[PDB]
Short mmCIF file of C-alpha atoms and ligand atoms in Angstrom, two decimals:
data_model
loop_
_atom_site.label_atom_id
_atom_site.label_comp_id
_atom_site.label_asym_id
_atom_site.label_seq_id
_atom_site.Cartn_x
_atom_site.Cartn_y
_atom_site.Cartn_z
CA UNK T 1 -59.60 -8.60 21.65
CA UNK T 2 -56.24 -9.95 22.65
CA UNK T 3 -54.89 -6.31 23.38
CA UNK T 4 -57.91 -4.46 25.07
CA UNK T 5 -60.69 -6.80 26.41
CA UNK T 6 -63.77 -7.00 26.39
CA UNK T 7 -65.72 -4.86 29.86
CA UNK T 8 -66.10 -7.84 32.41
CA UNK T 9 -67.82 -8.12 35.96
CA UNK T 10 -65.14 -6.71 38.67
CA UNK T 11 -65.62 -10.09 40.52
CA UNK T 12 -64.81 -11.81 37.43
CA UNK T 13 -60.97 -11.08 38.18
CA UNK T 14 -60.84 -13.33 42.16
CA UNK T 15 -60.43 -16.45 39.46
CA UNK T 16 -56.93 -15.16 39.15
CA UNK T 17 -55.61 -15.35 42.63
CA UNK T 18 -57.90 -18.12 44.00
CA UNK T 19 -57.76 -18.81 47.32
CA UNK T 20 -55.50 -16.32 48.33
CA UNK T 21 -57.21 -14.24 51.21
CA UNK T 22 -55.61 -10.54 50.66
CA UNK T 23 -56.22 -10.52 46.69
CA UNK T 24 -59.99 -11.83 47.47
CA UNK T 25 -60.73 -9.11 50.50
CA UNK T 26 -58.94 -6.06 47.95
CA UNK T 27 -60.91 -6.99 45.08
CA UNK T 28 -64.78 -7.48 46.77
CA UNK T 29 -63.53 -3.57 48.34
CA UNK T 30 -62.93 -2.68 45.21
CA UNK T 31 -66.15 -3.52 43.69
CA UNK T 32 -68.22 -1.87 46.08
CA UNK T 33 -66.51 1.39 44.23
CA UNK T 34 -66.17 0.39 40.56
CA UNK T 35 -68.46 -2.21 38.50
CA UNK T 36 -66.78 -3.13 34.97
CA UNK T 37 -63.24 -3.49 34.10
CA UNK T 38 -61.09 -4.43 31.00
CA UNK T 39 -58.36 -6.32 31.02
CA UNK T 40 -55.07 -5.25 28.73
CA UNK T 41 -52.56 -7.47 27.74
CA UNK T 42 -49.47 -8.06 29.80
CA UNK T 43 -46.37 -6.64 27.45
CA UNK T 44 -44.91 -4.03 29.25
CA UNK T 45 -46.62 -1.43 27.76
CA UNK T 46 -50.13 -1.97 29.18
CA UNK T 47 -49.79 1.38 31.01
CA UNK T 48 -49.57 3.89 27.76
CA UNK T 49 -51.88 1.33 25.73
CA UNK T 50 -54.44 1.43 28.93
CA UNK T 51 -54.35 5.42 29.15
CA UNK T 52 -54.79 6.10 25.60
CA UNK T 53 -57.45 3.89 25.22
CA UNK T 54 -59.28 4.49 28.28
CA UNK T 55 -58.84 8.48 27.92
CA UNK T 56 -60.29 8.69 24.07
CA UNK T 57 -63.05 6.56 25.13
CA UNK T 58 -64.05 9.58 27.83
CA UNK T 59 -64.16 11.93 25.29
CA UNK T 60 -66.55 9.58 23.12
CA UNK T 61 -69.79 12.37 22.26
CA UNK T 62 -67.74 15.32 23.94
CA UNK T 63 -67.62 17.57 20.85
CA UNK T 64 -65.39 20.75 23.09
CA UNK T 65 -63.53 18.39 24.92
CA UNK T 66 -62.61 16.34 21.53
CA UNK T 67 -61.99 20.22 19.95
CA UNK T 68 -59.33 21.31 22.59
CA UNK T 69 -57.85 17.71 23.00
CA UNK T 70 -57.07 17.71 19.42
CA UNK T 71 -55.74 21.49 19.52
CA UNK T 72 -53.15 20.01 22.08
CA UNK T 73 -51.88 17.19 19.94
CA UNK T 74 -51.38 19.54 16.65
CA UNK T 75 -48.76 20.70 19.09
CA UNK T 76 -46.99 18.07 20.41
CA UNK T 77 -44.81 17.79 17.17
CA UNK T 78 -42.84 21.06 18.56
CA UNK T 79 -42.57 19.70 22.27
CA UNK T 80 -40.67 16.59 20.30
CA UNK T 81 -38.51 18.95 18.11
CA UNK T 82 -37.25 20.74 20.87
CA UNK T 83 -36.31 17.77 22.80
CA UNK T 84 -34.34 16.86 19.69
CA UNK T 85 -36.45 14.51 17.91
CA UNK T 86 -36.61 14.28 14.19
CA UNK T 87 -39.67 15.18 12.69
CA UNK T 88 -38.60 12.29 9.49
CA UNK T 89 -38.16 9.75 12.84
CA UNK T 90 -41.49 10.59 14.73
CA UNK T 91 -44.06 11.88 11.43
CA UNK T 92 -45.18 7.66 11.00
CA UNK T 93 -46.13 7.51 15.25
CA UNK T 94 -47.58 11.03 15.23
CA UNK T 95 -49.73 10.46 11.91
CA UNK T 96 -50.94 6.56 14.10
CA UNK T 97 -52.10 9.26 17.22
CA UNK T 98 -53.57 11.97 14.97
CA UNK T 99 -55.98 9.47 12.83
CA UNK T 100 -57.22 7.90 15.79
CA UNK T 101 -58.10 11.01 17.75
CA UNK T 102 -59.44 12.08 14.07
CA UNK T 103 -61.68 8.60 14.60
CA UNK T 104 -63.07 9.75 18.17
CA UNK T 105 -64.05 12.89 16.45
CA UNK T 106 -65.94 11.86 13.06
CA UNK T 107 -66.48 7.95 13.86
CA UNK T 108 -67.21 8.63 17.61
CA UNK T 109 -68.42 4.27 18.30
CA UNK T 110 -66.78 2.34 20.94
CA UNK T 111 -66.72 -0.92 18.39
CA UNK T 112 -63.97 1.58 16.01
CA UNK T 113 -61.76 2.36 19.08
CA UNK T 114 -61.65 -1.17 20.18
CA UNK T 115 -60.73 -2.12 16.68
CA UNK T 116 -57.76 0.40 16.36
CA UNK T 117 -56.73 -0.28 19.89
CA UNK T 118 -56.38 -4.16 19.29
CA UNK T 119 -54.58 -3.84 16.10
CA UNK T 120 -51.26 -4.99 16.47
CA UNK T 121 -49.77 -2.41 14.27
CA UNK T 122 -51.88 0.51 14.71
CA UNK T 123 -51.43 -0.13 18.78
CA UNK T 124 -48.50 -0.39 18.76
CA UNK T 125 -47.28 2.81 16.66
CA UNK T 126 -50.01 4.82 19.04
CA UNK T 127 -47.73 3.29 22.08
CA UNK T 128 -44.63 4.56 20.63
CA UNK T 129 -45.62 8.19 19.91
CA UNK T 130 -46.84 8.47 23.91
CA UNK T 131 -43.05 6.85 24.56
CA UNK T 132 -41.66 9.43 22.76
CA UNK T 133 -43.86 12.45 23.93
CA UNK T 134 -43.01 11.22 27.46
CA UNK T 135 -39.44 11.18 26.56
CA UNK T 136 -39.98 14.69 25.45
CA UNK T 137 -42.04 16.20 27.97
CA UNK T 138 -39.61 15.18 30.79
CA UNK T 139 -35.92 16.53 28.87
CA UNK T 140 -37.12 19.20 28.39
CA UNK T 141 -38.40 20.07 32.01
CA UNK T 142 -35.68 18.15 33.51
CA UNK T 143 -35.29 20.62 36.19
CA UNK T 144 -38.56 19.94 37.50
CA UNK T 145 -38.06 16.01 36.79
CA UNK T 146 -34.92 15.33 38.66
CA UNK T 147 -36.72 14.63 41.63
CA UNK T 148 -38.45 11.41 40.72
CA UNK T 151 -29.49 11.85 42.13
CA UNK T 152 -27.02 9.37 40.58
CA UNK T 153 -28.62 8.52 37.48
CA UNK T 154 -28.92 11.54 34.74
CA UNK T 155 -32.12 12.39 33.57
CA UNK T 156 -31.44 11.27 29.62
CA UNK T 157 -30.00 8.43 30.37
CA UNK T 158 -33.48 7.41 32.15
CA UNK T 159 -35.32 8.51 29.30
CA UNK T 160 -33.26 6.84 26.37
CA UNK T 161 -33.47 3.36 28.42
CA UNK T 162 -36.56 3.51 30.76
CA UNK T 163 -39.09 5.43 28.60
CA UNK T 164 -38.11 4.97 25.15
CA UNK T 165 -37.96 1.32 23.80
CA UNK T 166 -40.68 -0.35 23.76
CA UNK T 167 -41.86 -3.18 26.78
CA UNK T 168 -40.27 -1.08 29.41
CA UNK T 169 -42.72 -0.39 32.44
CA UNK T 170 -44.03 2.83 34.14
CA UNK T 171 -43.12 4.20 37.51
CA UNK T 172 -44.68 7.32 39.19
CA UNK T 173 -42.47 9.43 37.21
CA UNK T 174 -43.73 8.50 33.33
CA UNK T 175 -46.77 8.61 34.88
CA UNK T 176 -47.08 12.26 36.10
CA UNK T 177 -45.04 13.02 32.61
CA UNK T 178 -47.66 11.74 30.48
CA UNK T 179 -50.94 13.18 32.29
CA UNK T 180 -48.88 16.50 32.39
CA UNK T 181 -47.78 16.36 28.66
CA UNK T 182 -51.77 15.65 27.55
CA UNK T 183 -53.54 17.38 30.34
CA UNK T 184 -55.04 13.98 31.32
CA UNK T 185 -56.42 13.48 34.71
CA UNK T 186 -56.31 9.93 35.72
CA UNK T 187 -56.56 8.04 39.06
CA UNK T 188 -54.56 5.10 40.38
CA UNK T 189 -55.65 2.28 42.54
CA UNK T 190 -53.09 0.38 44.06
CA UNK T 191 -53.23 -3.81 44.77
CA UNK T 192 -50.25 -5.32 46.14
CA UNK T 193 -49.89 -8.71 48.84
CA UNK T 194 -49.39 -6.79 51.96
CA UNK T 195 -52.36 -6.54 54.23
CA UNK T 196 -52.93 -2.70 54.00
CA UNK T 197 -55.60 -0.28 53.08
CA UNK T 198 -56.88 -0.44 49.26
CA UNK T 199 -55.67 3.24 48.26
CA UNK T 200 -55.18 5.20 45.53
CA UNK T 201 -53.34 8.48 43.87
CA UNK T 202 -55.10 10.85 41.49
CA UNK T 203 -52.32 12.88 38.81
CA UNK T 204 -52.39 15.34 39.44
CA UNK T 205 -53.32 16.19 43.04
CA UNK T 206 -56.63 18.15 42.73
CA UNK T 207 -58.26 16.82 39.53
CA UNK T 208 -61.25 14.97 38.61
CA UNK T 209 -60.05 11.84 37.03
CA UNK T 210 -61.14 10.96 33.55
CA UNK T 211 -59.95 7.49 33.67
CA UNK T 212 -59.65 4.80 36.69
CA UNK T 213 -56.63 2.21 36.37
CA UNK T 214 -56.21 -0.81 38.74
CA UNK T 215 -51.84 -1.87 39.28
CA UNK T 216 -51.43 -5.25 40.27
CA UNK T 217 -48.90 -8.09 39.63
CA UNK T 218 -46.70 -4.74 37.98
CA UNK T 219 -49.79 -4.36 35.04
CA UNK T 220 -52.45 -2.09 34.06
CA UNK T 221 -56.26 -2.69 33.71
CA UNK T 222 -59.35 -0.41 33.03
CA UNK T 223 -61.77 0.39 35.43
CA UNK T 224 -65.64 1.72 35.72
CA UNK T 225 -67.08 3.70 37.89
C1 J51 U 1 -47.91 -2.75 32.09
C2 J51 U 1 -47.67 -4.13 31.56
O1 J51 U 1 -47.83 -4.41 30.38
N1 J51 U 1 -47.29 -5.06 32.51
C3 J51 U 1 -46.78 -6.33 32.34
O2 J51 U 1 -46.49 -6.85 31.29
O3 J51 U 1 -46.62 -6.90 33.57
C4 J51 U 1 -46.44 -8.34 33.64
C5 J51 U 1 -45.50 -8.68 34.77
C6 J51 U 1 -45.95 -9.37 35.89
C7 J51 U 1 -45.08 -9.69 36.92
C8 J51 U 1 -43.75 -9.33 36.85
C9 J51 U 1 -43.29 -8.65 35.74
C10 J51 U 1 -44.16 -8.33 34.71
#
């Protein structure tokens, strides 16, 4: 389990920022509101591995919601062709994301997920294909995109999106959750001595999955 851990006690987490008051008064808030979390590895790419794991594991047992999930992603091979990606360059990171919806579907065990999900190469070629469907999503509404001046909008994509390790902002995150229909929710730990808040994407939903930034890194959380 040394990509997706274990679910833990959300008290279990003060051990790594002892003694330092703000961390300790965020997290005991935050477990009066959530009870489990899992912990993902720290790579730069714990968002995308976090949300696909997290999201398939919500539709564990949900045979329409597995149904119209898996209608979507038959799709998303035409969203990358007209973004001008290669079906030859994508088909190995598509065929990674198809099986292991496939598995949610006829498998349907938590234990099988997990497995997939902390397979280095399996992972990893799951991570890529939600790069590159990102990638996609935003060229080719890049109209609606350019608001998240200077900096073009393919140029972003090809170095902030793309390879591998690079992290998230609010901008690949609205991308993805738009390109899967994925509601998700956000909540927010930093040093300052604010409010514990969060952001749902998009504005009105019910969330499917619960993540926890902190220390620029994404873990799983349980309501
Ligand atoms: C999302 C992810 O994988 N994050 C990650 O690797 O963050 C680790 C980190 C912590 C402090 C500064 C930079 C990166």
């Amino acid at each position: 389990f040394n990509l997706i851990s274990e679910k833990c006690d959300i008290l279990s987490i003060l051990r790594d920022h002892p003694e330092n008051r703000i961390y300790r008064r965020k997290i005991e808030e935050l477990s009066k509101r959530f009870t489990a979390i899992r912990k993902t590895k720290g790579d730069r790419n714990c968002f995308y591995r976090a949300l696909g794991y997290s999201y398939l594991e919500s539709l564990l047992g949900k045979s329409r919601e597995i149904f119209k999930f898996k209608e979507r992603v038959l799709q998303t091979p035409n969203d990358l062709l007209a973004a001008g990606f290669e079906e030859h360059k994508f088909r190995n990171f598509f065929n990674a994301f198809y099986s292991v919806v496939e598995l949610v579907e006829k498998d349907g065990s938590v234990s099988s997920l997990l497995k997939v999900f902390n397979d280095q190469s399996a992972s990893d070629h799951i991570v890529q294909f939600l790069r590159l469907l990102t990638s996609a999503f935003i060229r080719n509404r890049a109209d609606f995109f350019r608001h998240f001046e200077e900096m073009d909008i393919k140029d972003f994509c090809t170095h902030e999106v793309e390879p591998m390790a690079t992290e998230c902002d609010h901008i690949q995150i609205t991308a993805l959750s738009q390109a899967l229909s994925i509601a998700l929710q956000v909540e927010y730990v930093d040093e300052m001595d604010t409010a514990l808040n969060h952001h749902v994407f998009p504005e009105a939903a019910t969330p499917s999955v619960y993540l926890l930034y902190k220390t620029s890194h994404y873990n799983i959380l349980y309501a």
